[PDB]
Amino acid sequence: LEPFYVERYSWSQLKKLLADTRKYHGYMMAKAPHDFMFVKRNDPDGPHSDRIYYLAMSGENRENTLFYSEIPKTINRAAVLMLSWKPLLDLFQVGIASYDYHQGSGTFLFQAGSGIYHVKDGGPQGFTQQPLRPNLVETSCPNIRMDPKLCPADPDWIAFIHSNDIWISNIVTREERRLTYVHNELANMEEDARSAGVATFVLQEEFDRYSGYWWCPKAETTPSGGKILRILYEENDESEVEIIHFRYPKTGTANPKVTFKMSEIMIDAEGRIIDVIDKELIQPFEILFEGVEYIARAGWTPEGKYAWSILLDRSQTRLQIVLISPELFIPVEDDVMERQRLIESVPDSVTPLIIYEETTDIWINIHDIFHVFPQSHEEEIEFIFASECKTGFRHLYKITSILKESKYKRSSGGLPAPSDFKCPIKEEIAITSGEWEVLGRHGSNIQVDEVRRLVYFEGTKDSPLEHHLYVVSYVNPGEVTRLTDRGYSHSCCISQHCDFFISKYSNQKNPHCVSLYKLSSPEDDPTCKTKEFWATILDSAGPLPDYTPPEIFSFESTTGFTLYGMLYKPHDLQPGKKYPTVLFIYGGPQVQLVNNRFKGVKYFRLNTLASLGYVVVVIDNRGSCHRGLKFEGAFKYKMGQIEIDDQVEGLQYLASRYDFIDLDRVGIHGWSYGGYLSLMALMQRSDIFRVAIAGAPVTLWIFYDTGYTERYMGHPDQNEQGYYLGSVAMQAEKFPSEPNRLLLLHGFLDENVHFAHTSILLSFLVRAGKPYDLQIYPQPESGEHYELHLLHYLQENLGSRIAALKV
Amino acid sequence: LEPFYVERYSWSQLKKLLADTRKYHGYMMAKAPHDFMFVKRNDPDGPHSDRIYYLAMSGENRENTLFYSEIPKTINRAAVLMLSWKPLLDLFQVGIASYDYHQGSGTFLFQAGSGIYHVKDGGPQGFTQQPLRPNLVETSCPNIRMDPKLCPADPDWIAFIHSNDIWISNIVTREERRLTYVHNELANMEEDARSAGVATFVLQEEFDRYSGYWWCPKAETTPSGGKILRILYEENDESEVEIIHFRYPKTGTANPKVTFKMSEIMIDAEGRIIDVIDKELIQPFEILFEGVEYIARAGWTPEGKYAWSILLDRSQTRLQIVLISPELFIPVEDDVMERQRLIESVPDSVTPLIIYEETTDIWINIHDIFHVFPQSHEEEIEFIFASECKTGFRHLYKITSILKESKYKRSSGGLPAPSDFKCPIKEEIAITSGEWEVLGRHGSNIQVDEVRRLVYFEGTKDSPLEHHLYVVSYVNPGEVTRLTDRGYSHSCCISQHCDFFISKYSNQKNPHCVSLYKLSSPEDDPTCKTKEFWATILDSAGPLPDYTPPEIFSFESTTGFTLYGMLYKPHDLQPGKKYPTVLFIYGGPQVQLVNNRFKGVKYFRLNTLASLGYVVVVIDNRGSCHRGLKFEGAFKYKMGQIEIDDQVEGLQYLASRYDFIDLDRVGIHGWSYGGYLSLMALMQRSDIFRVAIAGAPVTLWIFYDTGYTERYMGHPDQNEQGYYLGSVAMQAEKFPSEPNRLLLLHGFLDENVHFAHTSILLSFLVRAGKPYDLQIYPQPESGEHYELHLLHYLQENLGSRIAALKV
Ligand SMILES: *C(=O)C(CC)(CC)C(=O)Nc1cc(CN2CCN(Cc3ccc(Br)cc3)CC2)cc(CN2CCN(Cc3ccc(Br)cc3)CC2)c1
Ligand SMILES: *C(=O)C(CC)(CC)C(=O)Nc1cc(CN2CCN(Cc3ccc(Br)cc3)CC2)cc(CN2CCN(Cc3ccc(Br)cc3)CC2)c1
Ligand SMILES: [Cl-]
Ligand SMILES: [Cl-]
Ligand code: NA
Numbered sequence A, B: 001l002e003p004f005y006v007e008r009y010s011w012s013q014l015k016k017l018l019a020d021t022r023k024y025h026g027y028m029m030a031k032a033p034h035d036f037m038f039v040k041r042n043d044p045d046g047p048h049s050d051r052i053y054y055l056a057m058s059g060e061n062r063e064n065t066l067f068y069s070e071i072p073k074t075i076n077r078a079a080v081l082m083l084s085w086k087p088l089l090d091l092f093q094v095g096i097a098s099y100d101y102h103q104g105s106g107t108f109l110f111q112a113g114s115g116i117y118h119v120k121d122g123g124p125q126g127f128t129q130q131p132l133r134p135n136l137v138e139t140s141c142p143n144i145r146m147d148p149k150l151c152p153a154d155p156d157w158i159a160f161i162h163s164n165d166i167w168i169s170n171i172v173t174r175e176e177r178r179l180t181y182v183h184n185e186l187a188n189m190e191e192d193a194r195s196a197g198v199a200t201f202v203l204q205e206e207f208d209r210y211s212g213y214w215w216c217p218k219a220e221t222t223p224s225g226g227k228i229l230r231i232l233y234e235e236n237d238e239s240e241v242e243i244i245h246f247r248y249p250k251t252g253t254a255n256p257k258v259t260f261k262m263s264e265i266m267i268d269a270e271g272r273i274i275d276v277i278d279k280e281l282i283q284p285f286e287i288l289f290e291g292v293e294y295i296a297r298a299g300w301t302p303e304g305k306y307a308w309s310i311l312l313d314r315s316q317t318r319l320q321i322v323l324i325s326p327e328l329f330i331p332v333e334d335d336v337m338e339r340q341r342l343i344e345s346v347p348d349s350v351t352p353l354i355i356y357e358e359t360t361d362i363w364i365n366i367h368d369i370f371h372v373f374p375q376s377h378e379e380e381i382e383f384i385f386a387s388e389c390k391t392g393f394r395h396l397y398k399i400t401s402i403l404k405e406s407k408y409k410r411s412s413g414g415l416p417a418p419s420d421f422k423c424p425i426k427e428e429i430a431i432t433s434g435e436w437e438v439l440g441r442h443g444s445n446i447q448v449d450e451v452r453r454l455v456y457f458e459g460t461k462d463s464p465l466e467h468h469l470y471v472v473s474y475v476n477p478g479e480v481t482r483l484t485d486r487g488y489s490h491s492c493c494i495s496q497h498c499d500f501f502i503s504k505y506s507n508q509k510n511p512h513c514v515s516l517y518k519l520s521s522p523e524d525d526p527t528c529k530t531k532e533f534w535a536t537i538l539d540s541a542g543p544l545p546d547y548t549p550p551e552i553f554s555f556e557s558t559t560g561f562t563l564y565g566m567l568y569k570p571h572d573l574q575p576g577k578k579y580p581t582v583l584f585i586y587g588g589p590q591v592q593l594v595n596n597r598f599k600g601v602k603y604f605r606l607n608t609l610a611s612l613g614y615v616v617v618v619i620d621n622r623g624s625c626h627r628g629l630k631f632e633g634a635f636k637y638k639m640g641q642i643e644i645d646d647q648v649e650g651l652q653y654l655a656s657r658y659d660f661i662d663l664d665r666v667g668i669h670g671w672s673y674g675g676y677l678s679l680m681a682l683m684q685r686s687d688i689f690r691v692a693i694a695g696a697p698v699t700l701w702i703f704y705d706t707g708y709t710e711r712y713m714g715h716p717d718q719n720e721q722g723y724y725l726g727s728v729a730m731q732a733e734k735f736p737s738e739p740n741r742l743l744l745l746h747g748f749l750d751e752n753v754h755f756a757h758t759s760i761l762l763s764f765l766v767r768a769g770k771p772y773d774l775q776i777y778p779q780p781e782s783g784e785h786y787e788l789h790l791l792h793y794l795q796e797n798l799g800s801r802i803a804a805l806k807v
């Protein structure tokens, strides 16, 4: 077996090769249709049953905007119907990321650039046949308005954030009122570190929560003829949180001081504000919710009788679903005389209600699944929730909880015990089960059909390489019925009326498609669900000829799990020759790289590496996503210690199976946790790995945030050895004494993994007498430079003939 | 002619080679004896005429401290007397950079670490024969005290800076009093940006002025029996000066707002403070000193009748020597009623006195030469000054100026004209002349013998490669007499009594020596000066065998100047072979690299390069030091444009003269302006230069300070093209498209040439699609890493066989 050497291109020739083969900019295709919504026409004489609204990007150099399409009552089943995209909005006098809608009025609300706009379609006023003009919500606010939301109780009112405070605005009367006076934009960021209605850094970055306020969905009527609207909101104080060059709670240090507040808004009979009463909790947040760090999720019950909240402790091993009555809130009064009367006036029976609680030795994984049924009995609440805590796989559970009067009484003048607010669980039926998970993140949710008493959900039952749509009953659970076709992975939106679903689907060979599917039952059994192809929304471009996709492989690991991987064979594969191998890696939690999805957009350059004569390998090691909580928990307290074993094991599996892998010329490369592991690979296994290109590596776990690090590694005092061994900066001495094996890539203004990680690693590498190569990216045309430098670095120090002579 | 290839050592082998050959740490030898002072014994029966005091480092791992040595009345001229070093101070209960002394009391004052200390020797109390105990000046000041100075009028009092304010302290009574209340350490650096008695950044960095206050050398007696002491001081406001991550006035932006203040200190008959009156100028600084940016130098006349100051304009093309009477200062009064009486009470004849003024089209070069003779007539002042403005070479001039009453009268209530304070010049004799300069920087000054009416000075008369001591009359100037021996460069201290001088001397082959020389006249002519070797103070270690020094060469440049250089021939020079060449460069103003001095300490690694088989070249291009103002002015408004022409010219001179220079493998390398020029070399002349290693390069002249940039390049608006063409960051497109030719080295916390220069160059290189290599030094063991990486980089991309195959 002779070694294959890649063609030694010049820097200009590589720049040319990259530019000629490039087809997407910023690793981004035009946004496929998303954020679907079905509205019924209700026109017996007309040809259409529904109108669907959705956000999409019409072309490559185009802005994301609202379109609609017509769903016909019948179809020509010999033909294939391609639904035409009708633009909902007219061109402006600036792209839309999301939108709101109020079923009963037709009112859309959305932000596009600086403006907040609205239109009407599909309410009482009917359905347009031409693009509507977006109506600007006018303002006297100087700065950009963020996070607009329609009030579901009254579609004339909206709320939004401006300079970290909550405002409301009427789109008909033009009235505009500030609700919170927590932040003062004249005062500096060190003194005034408070905010209302806004999720702080860790909650956005690590818990995927981007909003901090929620409208009450119903309006309390007043005797006068007017009403009371309500906004539940989070209020954060970040004074004690560490500063960096904004507020970044690094692991071990303080998180924000948080609480719930409520804004009570009296409107008169003609939509004019009478008064605004800002209301705080009756007792402090620390007393009523013992041991809670993070407000993970929040909202209201369907009838708006209670506010709900999913709450976590600092260790992220205890979740609590807690109902909060509006009566727990009293007006803010710095006068202690009036305040004391308000505390005593609120009943003792009015108390927080912990309707659910769960624990784990691994960690809680927050998701977006939580459905509350209409309240039939006064002293019971019925909901569906998902959890990994019973069986180690995320499954749906229907839970009924009893709303007891609490044993703790506030009149006694003491503090409540740890479990005085715990509601008894009457019932707890398992809706799904097995060695597979329900998906509750990244758009995956559930659609509950309350009529037929079913629940649609996404899951990994057929395969961990494919997401599929399933349906099952929630009263008499049993037969789980797959609705999506095997051989693709699916991301699905189900109509609110539960008679259609859309699926965005792909596999390794075929690009993304979006298609509409009609749902129906057989006449003999309404429980049984079948689907029929109705129409195409987005048609695939087809298997483009210049991308050769990889093969999914697997191997039985000595760890006792099947580990999956991807293999890009070199193009023009020569007989009796061995090729240099690049291992692309991420390897951290909450990500799966290996599945039956199209990888020719984001990872197109793994194919480009294969075209030059590199074997490219990717392996989902233990800790990675979609394999259950036990598989994920493998590296608890042990980050860095187990990942490379699985990579090396999978690499040796391929070497014995394929003679064309040259194990003497193996490189490794990743970004973020991938960069971290690329450093760990060269440190621990320099026998295996010739070169490591670490992009934006975590080098020091004490420099990363609370929400992420503490979930997987705990508090630093309780894991002194894990933090030391897991931090590559502390082990600089263990890097190679050869140069041309280590390359560090990092941006200067990266606010996720700070440059500090790279610079402190550089600091200790220099003190340890070790060589490194470095590229920096200070503050479009630089993804070009990165790709260029990477090909050149691999060529010069791994792939080419010159590289072998260099050692 | 076959190419020689350097031995390809591994990274570990290079680290070993560097460690084995290393003999100094941080490019620093132990400090040779400096800051000399001669005190007469005045003991007719005893064997010694003088005691000399001086600062020195006794060994390598040792602190800089005060020693003394005994100068005998006679010597054994057959033998060579090596003076023993006697320690002046005892070990403490922490090194000394400088000291003060009060002739008439014996009082030394010095800072060592945090403490300010004092001892006595050589006054009325006599001469110790054993180490004295340093006496701590006690304090209630919390923070470190800076810049201590004895009051020459009263050796009981000192002054010092504490938290940017001037304090005084009595070393006998222990009284301690704050004089200025300008800075408040509780208030932050953005709000309170004021300071007193302290030179701001640009004055320290670019004008070598480190102090901002000066004691009046005489004490005004009061009727009571007490007296008045005076401190002239600079007061700076840096509010409008730009901030960076301290106050850095970048070119084009505002410098500090400056003025003169005076502290008047009434002491009673027993050394106790009665009162302290803080006094400001009668009219603003901007009115009295029209067009002055920088207070370059300041002090007092010998009798203390006037304060003096050397003042510059923003362009640094107009110097003014200005006398300032204490009567120009009035007490500070925010009450306008009392203030108005004080303004009218001061006479109109009391006015600033511009005793000298000069201009140039090139630039003024500040120096430390300024001697004022005792005032014989009431309306005349007599002084020696040095200047390049008459002839383009720095020469000494004796000037007599007439102290006129000013035509401008303050009672009129108008502002003064541009030239109303100009004093008529009665006389202006040239003391020296020719195509050579007097030296007035870096310790070089003049010693004026007022008895014999001579002046000792350092100069370049015998050679621009050697500094020498000369003497000449200042009444009847003529025969300039060299006192130092040819074949060495000399740095000299002359005794205050003008009967001895010490010289620290070296040449290319022999390390530094320090020797004492006795001065005397022939009996027939007191004007004629001769010298005799008296004793050795520091003996040279001798030509150490592992350093081969370079040869000084020269060549007649087409520019019309003789340009000098240094050549390190490769060791073990083989016949009929050509060697790779490294050009070491600085090339900026105010530096000369090429002279007859020992280069085996600071530039020892140029020899180490020669030992591996590199030709090392150094060339003093136009703009560099010690060749006159015309030679220096060559690159005015044109930095970057002319330097590399001279380097390439000198390189081609050597190539035609020596066949062993391989012009196909020429590298360039420098730090600071050298790094800047290394970038300019690869940009302009990639035909000549294969590789460029730029250390801490200036890449953008608008990012550098006012004092330096504007002196050589003017204000950016008046030189738009020079700034653009001189800034390498703006011309990233002109760098090579080949990799392995450009290497950038920069510290992260460099506060002279900021990292910003490198990062913005990196920014534009990435946008231009250009390759670079980078090493960073974030925040002893790293000069090791730099040297290691440089040898390896030259080896891999210039010197070795692998480097030639790589292209
Ligand atoms: C990790 O999670 C983070 C996101 C938080 C970093 C902490 C991450 O994913 N980073 C990441 C970085 C890059 C590199 N780009 C960063 C931005 N930079 C902009 C810029 C602007 C101005 C200047 Br002067 C310089 C730079 C451009 C560079 C890229 C990616 C995306 N992945 C890269 C790897 N890729 C596979 C692959 C493999 C081989 C080759 Br050749 C090409 C691609 C998958 C996507 C993420
Ligand atoms: C230019 O004027 C400046 C001073 C203001 C820079 C703007 C300059 O002279 N710089 C300069 C830098 C170095 C390099 N050292 C910088 C400090 N650094 C400390 C450090 C601490 C912690 C860490 Br983690 C990293 C780094 C160490 C590196 C050196 C010098 C001195 N000259 C170097 C060149 N030398 C000749 C020479 C030639 C070849 C070889 Br091999 C070795 C030496 C002359 C002295 C100045
Ligand atoms: Cl079941
Ligand atoms: Cl003369
Ligand atoms: Na996120």
Ligand code: NA
Residues within 6 Å of the ligand: B204, B205, B206, B208
């Ligand atoms: Na200086």
